[PDB]
From Swiss-Prot, chain D:
Molecular function GO labels: mRNA binding; structural constituent of ribosome
Source organism: Saccharomyces cerevisiae (strain ATCC 204508 / S288c)
GO cellular component: cytoplasm; cytosol; cytosolic small ribosomal subunit
Location of this fragment in the whole protein: 20 to 119 of 121
Modification(s) after translation: N-terminally acetylated by acetyltransferase NatA. Also partially acetylated by NatC.
Protein name, UniProt field: Small ribosomal subunit protein uS10
Subunit structure: Component of the small ribosomal subunit (SSU). Mature yeast ribosomes consist of a small (40S) and a large (60S) subunit. The 40S small subunit contains 1 molecule of ribosomal RNA (18S rRNA) and 33 different proteins (encoded by 57 genes). The large 60S subunit contains 3 rRNA molecules (25S, 5.8S and 5S rRNA) and 46 different proteins (encoded by 81 genes).
One GO term of the biological process aspect: cytoplasmic translation
Covalent cross-link (Glycyl lysine isopeptide (Lys-Gly) (interchain with G-Cter in ubiquitin)), residues: 2, 13, 82
Family: Belongs to the universal ribosomal protein uS10 family.
From Swiss-Prot, chain E:
Location of this chain's protein in the cell: Cytoplasm
Gene: RPS16A
Name recorded for this polypeptide: Small ribosomal subunit protein uS9A
A Gene Ontology BP annotation from the UniProt entry: translational initiation
Positions of modified residues (Phosphothreonine): 68
Misc. comment: Present with 33800 molecules/cell in log phase SD medium. There are 2 genes for uS9 in yeast.
PANTHER family on file: RIBOSOMAL PROTEIN S16, RIBOSOMAL PROTEIN S9
Superkingdom field: Eukaryota
Assigned protein family: Belongs to the universal ribosomal protein uS9 family.
From Swiss-Prot, chain H:
Keyword Cytoplasm among UniProt keywords: yes
Origin superkingdom: Eukaryota
Subcellular locations according to the entry: Cytoplasm
Organism: Saccharomyces cerevisiae (strain ATCC 204508 / S288c) (Baker's yeast)
GO MF term (any one): mRNA binding
Post-translational modification: N-terminally acetylated by acetyltransferase NatA.
Name of the protein in its database record: Small ribosomal subunit protein uS7
Primary residence: cytoplasm
Cross-link entry Glycyl lysine isopeptide (Lys-Gly) (interchain with G-Cter in ubiquitin), positions: 81
Role description: Component of the ribosome, a large ribonucleoprotein complex responsible for the synthesis of proteins in the cell. The small ribosomal subunit (SSU) binds messenger RNAs (mRNAs) and translates the encoded message by selecting cognate aminoacyl-transfer RNA (tRNA) molecules. The large subunit (LSU) contains the ribosomal catalytic site termed the peptidyl transferase center (PTC), which catalyzes the formation of peptide bonds, thereby polymerizing the amino acids delivered by tRNAs into a polypeptide chain.
Keyword Iron-sulfur: no
Family in the record: Belongs to the universal ribosomal protein uS7 family.
Subunit text: Component of the small ribosomal subunit (SSU). Mature yeast ribosomes consist of a small (40S) and a large (60S) subunit. The 40S small subunit contains 1 molecule of ribosomal RNA (18S rRNA) and 33 different proteins (encoded by 57 genes). The large 60S subunit contains 3 rRNA molecules (25S, 5.8S and 5S rRNA) and 46 different proteins (encoded by 81 genes).
UniProt KW keywords: Acetylation, Cytoplasm, Isopeptide bond, Phosphoprotein, Ribonucleoprotein, Ribosomal protein, Ubl conjugation
Gene name of the encoded protein: RPS5
From Swiss-Prot, chain I:
Protein task: Component of the ribosome, a large ribonucleoprotein complex responsible for the synthesis of proteins in the cell. The small ribosomal subunit (SSU) binds messenger RNAs (mRNAs) and translates the encoded message by selecting cognate aminoacyl-transfer RNA (tRNA) molecules. The large subunit (LSU) contains the ribosomal catalytic site termed the peptidyl transferase center (PTC), which catalyzes the formation of peptide bonds, thereby polymerizing the amino acids delivered by tRNAs into a polypeptide chain.
Chief subcellular location: cytoplasm
Protein name from the UniProt record: Small ribosomal subunit protein eS17A
Record-stated family: Belongs to the eukaryotic ribosomal protein eS17 family.
Organism name: Saccharomyces cerevisiae (strain ATCC 204508 / S288c)
Length: 53, 82, 145, 100, 141, 167, 143, 103, 63
RNA sequence: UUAAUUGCGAUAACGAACGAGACCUUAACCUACUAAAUAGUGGUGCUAGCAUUUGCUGGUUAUCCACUUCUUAGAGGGACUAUCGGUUUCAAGCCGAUGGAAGUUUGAGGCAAUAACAGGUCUGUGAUGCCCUUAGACGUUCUGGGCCGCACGCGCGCUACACUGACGGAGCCAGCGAGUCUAACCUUGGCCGAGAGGUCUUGGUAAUCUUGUGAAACUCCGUCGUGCUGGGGAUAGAGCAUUGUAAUUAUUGCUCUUCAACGAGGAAUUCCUAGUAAGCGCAAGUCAUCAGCUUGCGUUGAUUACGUCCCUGCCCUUUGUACACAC
């Protein structure tokens, strides 16, 4: 019961997970969007982030 | 095992740094006839210590024999008044 | 500008606790030749002894050094705040100390041997000669044995 | 009341028209107010690798989001301010009012 | 009612704004006299105008300069451009255009940057290298 | 609560979330895109769909449950989310609608060549300057290949692609 | 002729004011100086043992005069430098705050510097009034 | 302080005295045959004349008592007067000498 | 480089072939009428056409 | 003629499409419906110096008064080979002369075709067939270990081998940028405290708070003077702190001892044509404090630019081929 998830994940690398695919790598924590670098590339257009230079 | 060195020789420099009467009166009688006097000029001609060169230079300008023209650090340019 | 008469009393070498200490150089940087006292420690011991910092190792009287050595031997006696010393709270005693020219190696051997005798990770590493402060041994340290 | 309506949109054309018709609609009421204050643009830069894996030349694409914030100072009664702001609402633009 | 003119000079990222009026022949930078920066290399740089056309145009004109941005040498460049424009703009509005077009001709001949702000803005850095054009290193085996 | 910088970047995710959410259930409904209208204590979410009667359902059955999904997804106060659906003209001018149409035709069992020829022919009549379709993968071979369909004149480079081209 | 502060040199002022403070002997330094690093990035203490604090007080006094409000952390940044982390590349490092803090309360203690609103220090009336005797040597000699 | 004539003239006389009048360029030939002597433009002269004076000074003040200011002077003193011992002058005629042999 | 493309060369040629008495040798007075005579979507493009129109005008002036 | 299948033009081709260009982003003169005292303010109120004659800085908070030329960027704007000088079937166009925030398309970047690669990624994906798979498993986790292990070789890197330099003062000057709900992140000042962080938070829908970025580099004056020296925490030992239900294989920062290799580094090799290179450092990504990496940047600011194809590779054409995934 208490040991099922006893080891903390409130800090470090296990706390953050991609809000689209739950991955823990290549995350964009800046501005609090928390999408992986792979998925942000597809979602950059509709999130408002556009290429200019 | 190889250490990739050259290890050239040395000249065994003997810059004296505490000066006695023999050096003190030698520089006093030789500060004339020197068109350009500096820290490196003193040590490369009268073989005195590096700090002695700048301290002696301050002594020669305190009483005043060699008239400085440029008082910059890292390069002291003193001439002798005539 | 200040000039002095140089006599034969100049000592080209100094004898401090069976170690050759150079003359004709700054007293602060001459004392660094002693194992255990360096640029800062010589600065402090010379401040406590009230010796003119501009003077060399040539014109120093025997009394001027006898206080310098006394400070080196017993720093805690002169009310030192116990953060300059190289050996604070020794494992063997717990009291503030400061290592000497020959004591620094003796205690370094003593503090290395206690790790060896207890077979700690650090002690087996010093016995091995490998890096003990976590440095990777994969890349650095090939031409050392 | 010393109201300060604020505008924090990203599309400049949407900001510029809605601010233009906020001044002319407030001036048509013959009320006092200040002209728009153009704050510096706030570009938000997300610099990321282009590749999904870790193979290839190190190529990076830098996405930018432009944020344009504008405030206009007005002193108008609320019983007309409420009917001033909510009308000509524009999609994408963010027109909001504050109290004190 | 006091005859004044506010002008600007620019550098790589430095900018000096000059307030030029009909005063007492004083020149000041950043609340301090321009004559006491004294690094003995750039003293002549801010002195170049008054050194080449004299003080005949500096008798009854007070100039105060506020420079910001950039570095030491950049700020000095901006300072020279600010005081240069101020004298140009001062004789543009109040003194004869003959005085202004002759001082511009001497200032241009001595140094174009006495009138033109240097158009050499920095180049942004690109990826794959340490700088704008330099690369990291090409390894082959 | 949140700085206007980070609030706006969170708006795009709220749209990016809504755009992805509305592409899965409403697939058979010909969903094209969504637009979000933000109002003080109100949010208008407009759906451009091919089949309004399907997205509406009986007595609004198919328009109210999705309104509840978005409401309970982001935990707003009840009654502050309003869901509207409209018939979107120019079905051929929306690449999303055409791409799903080919997807559903492929899942039905229709040959890839005829389905791709149908869509470019349909986009032809819709008033498009040009259209392009690529079907990449296993096509009559265990080895993948990406064979293409197009007509008219397209554009590949420059800013006009960002506006005059829908992908 | 007219008297003003900034119309004199900056390099000779700092030294001359420090000698003024040293000669007067009223700064009221507790005495624990010549012990601390004076900056965590500075690995050696000042060479000017008998001074280094009359100048620092002279340095801050001119600094607070030209500024309006300054803080302990701000002056640590102003007097800080780069720490040589050996092989690691250089980084800016702030100075110890005690030296800067106790050099300002010393200025408070003797009357040079008064506390200011919105936090910080300020050039005081007594601090400015003693600059006339400071600039007297400069003006008398050159004119 | 030395050479009581105009100080600037010495520098320009130094530069005008160490500009190599002719040097030799690399020619491939049939794998390796020779080097060919070619004339030097006045702009190339000044480029080399400035360089040799500045190279000599940096290499002379390195690891010695002499400051970069005083040793850069002593290279210009000998370059302007002509001593065949200054770093710039020795290299100038050495390059000229080798160009003469490899005409 | 300095060479210009067909999109400004044929546009300039077409204008001269049709609007000859309305334009003249000067670039500045040709810019004002080129942007109102022909719908040009770019400031840079309209500048190029007006420059190639006055260029051919100088050539037409002599033979 | 091309930093252009760019155009001028012979023309069995004509008319087109894609690519290039055009397009989009920055610096910066509109001084009039682009500014709040969120920036010098033009006159408030007085205090600290001298001249009773004419300055050098601080400022309560909705009286303002003919308010906007600097980091702020819309509407006719602006730079198109101006014009001119010469060279070319005067044809598109090399090159020079004053000019203007700038002239080989202004600088730089984004976007960027048609084939292809068994290129890389099944370890981003809740995007996907097979695996003695559905109550001892590769699934799901919990504790302890570990690319955090050393005979060795290689790649990207950091700091040095010092007087143009180390250290001690002192003077201080940028630009990108970030920072707050089931919040103690952004160390502002009044925590005595004193590297670090517990006290309090008086603090802006982040120009008035960190930060008028108030920083490293740099730069008057002094300390050693050419030595394996003050170029030395590279490597050990001893201690002091904060993030972390937890660091022993230094988390990281701080104070103290000794010189260790290293003395313009072999063959070889990389990058580079302007405010570039190079020196320097800062913000962001990562981040539980603190990263020798990256991305951006900004400070100080070098030798030729009339280049060549022999210097390894591209583009086009002609030619030979016994080659054909093709030397």
């Amino acid at each position: 019961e208490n040991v099922w998830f006893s080891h903390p994940r409130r800090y470090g690398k296990g706390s953050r997970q991609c809000r689209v695919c739950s991955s823990h790598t290549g995350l964009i924590r800046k501005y609090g969007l928390n999408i992986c670098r792979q998925c942000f590339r597809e979602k950059a257009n509709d999130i408002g982030f556009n290429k200019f230079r | 095992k190889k250490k990739w060195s050259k290890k050239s020789m040395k000249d065994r420099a003997q810059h004296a740094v505490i000066l006695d009467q023999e050096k003190y009166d030698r520089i006093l009688k030789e500060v004339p006839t020197y068109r350009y006097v500096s820290v490196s000029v003193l040590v490369d001609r009268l073989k005195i210590g590096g700090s002695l060169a700048r301290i002696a230079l301050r002594h020669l300008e305190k009483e005043g024999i060699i008239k400085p023209i440029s008082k910059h650090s890292k390069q002291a340019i003193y001439t002798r008044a005539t | 500008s200040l000039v002095v008469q140089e006599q034969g009393s100049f000592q080209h070498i100094l004898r401090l606790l069976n170690t050759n200490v150079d003359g004709n150089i700054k007293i602060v940087y001459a004392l660094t030749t002693i194992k255990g006292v360096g640029r800062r420690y010589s600065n402090l011991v010379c401040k406590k002894a009230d010796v003119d910092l501009h003077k060399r190792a040539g014109e120093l009287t025997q009394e001027e050094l006898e206080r310098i050595v006394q400070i080196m031997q017993n720093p805690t006696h002169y009310k030192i705040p116990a953060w300059f010393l190289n050996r604070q709270n020794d494992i063997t005693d717990g009291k503030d100390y400061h290592t000497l020219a020959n004591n620094v190696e003796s205690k370094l051997r003593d503090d290395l041997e206690r790790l060896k005798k207890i077979r700690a990770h650090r002690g087996i590493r010093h016995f091995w000669g490998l890096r003990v402060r976590g440095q990777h041994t994969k890349t650095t340290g090939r031409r050392r044995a | 009341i010393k109201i300060r309506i604020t505008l924090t949109s990203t599309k400049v054309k949407q900001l510029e028209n809605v601010s233009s018709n906020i001044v002319k609609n407030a001036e048509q009421h013959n009320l006092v107010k200040k002209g728009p204050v153009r704050l510096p643009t706030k570009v938000l830069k997300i610099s990321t690798r282009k590749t999904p894996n870790g193979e290839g030349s190190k190529t990076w694409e830098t996405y930018e989001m432009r944020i344009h914030k504008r405030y206009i100072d007005l002193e108008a009664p609320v019983q007309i301010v409420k009917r001033i702001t909510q009308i000509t609402i524009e999609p994408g633009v963010d027109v909001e009012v504050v109290v004190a | 009612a006091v005859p004044s003119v506010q002008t600007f000079g620019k550098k790589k990222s430095a900018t000096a704004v000059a307030h030029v009026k009909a005063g007492k022949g004083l020149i000041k930078v950043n609340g301090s006299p321009i004559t006491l920066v004294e690094p003995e290399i750039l003293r002549f740089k801010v002195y170049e105008p008054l050194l080449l056309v004299g003080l005949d145009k500096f008798s009854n004109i007070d100039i105060r300069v506020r420079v910001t941005g950039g570095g030491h040498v950049s700020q000095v460049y901006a300072i020279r451009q600010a005081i240069a424009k101020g004298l140009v703009a001062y004789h543009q509005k109040y003194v004869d255009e003959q005085s202004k077009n002759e001082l511009k001709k001497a200032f241009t001949s001595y140094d174009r940057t006495l009138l033109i702000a240097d158009s050499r803005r920095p180049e942004p850095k690109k990826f794959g290298g340490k700088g704008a054009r330099s690369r990291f290193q090409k390894s082959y085996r | 609560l949140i700085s206007k910088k980070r609030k706006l970047v969170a708006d795009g995710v709220f749209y990016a979330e809504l755009n992805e959410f509305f592409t899965r259930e409403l697939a058979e409904e010909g969903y094209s895109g969504v637009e979000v209208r933000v109002t003080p204590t109100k949010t208008e979410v407009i759906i451009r769909a091919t089949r309004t009667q399907d997205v509406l359902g009986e007595n609004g059955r198919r328009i109210n449950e999705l309104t509840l999904l978005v409401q309970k997804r982001f935990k707003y106060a009840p009654g502050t989310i309003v869901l509207y659906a409209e018939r979107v003209q120019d079905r051929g001018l929306s690449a999303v609608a055409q791409a799903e149409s080919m997807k559903f035709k492929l899942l039905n069992g229709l040959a890839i060549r005829r389905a791709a020829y149908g869509v470019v022919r349909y986009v032809m009549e819709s008033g498009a300057k040009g259209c392009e379709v690529v079907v990449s993968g296993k096509l009559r071979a265990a080895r993948a290949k990406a064979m293409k369909f197009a007509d008219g004149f397209l554009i590949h480079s420059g800013q006009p692609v960002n506006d005059f081209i829908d992908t | 002729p007219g008297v003003s502060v900034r119309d004199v040199a900056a390099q000779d002022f700092i030294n001359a004011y420090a000698s003024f403070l040293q000669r007067q002997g009223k700064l009221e330094v507790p005495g624990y100086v010549d012990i601390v690093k004076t900056s965590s990035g500075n690995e050696m203490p000042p060479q000017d043992a008998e001074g280094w604090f009359y100048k620092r007080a002279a340095s801050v006094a001119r600094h607070i005069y030209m500024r309006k409000q300054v803080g302990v952390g701000k002056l640590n940044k102003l007097y800080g430098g780069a720490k040589s982390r050996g092989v690691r590349p250089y980084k800016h490092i702030d100075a110890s705050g005690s030296i800067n803090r106790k050099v300002l309360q010393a200025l408070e203690k003797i009357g040079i510097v008064e506390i200011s609103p919105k936090g910080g220090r300020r050039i005081s009336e007594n601090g400015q009034r003693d600059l006339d005797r400071i600039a007297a040597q400069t003006l008398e000699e050159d004119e | 302080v030395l050479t009581d004539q105009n100080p600037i003239q010495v520098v320009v006389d130094a530069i005008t005295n160490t500009g190599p009048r002719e040097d030799t360029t690399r020619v491939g030939g049939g794998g390796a045959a020779r080097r060919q002597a070619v004339d030097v433009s006045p702009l190339r002269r000044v480029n080399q004349a400035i360089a040799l004076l500045t190279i000599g000074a940096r290499e002379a003040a390195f690891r010695n008592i002499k400051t970069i200011a005083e040793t850069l002077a002593e290279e210009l003193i000998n370059a302007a007067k002509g001593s065949s011992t200054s770093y710039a002058i020795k290299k100038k005629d050495e390059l000229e000498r080798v160009a003469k042999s490899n005409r | 480089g300095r060479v210009r493309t067909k999109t400004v060369k044929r546009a300039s040629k077409a204008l001269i072939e049709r609007y000859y008495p309305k334009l003249t040798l000067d670039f500045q007075t040709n810019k004002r009428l080129c942007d109102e005579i022909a719908t040009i979507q770019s400031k840079r493009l309209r500048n190029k056409i007006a420059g190639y129109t006055t260029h051919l005008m100088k050539r037409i002036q002599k033979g």
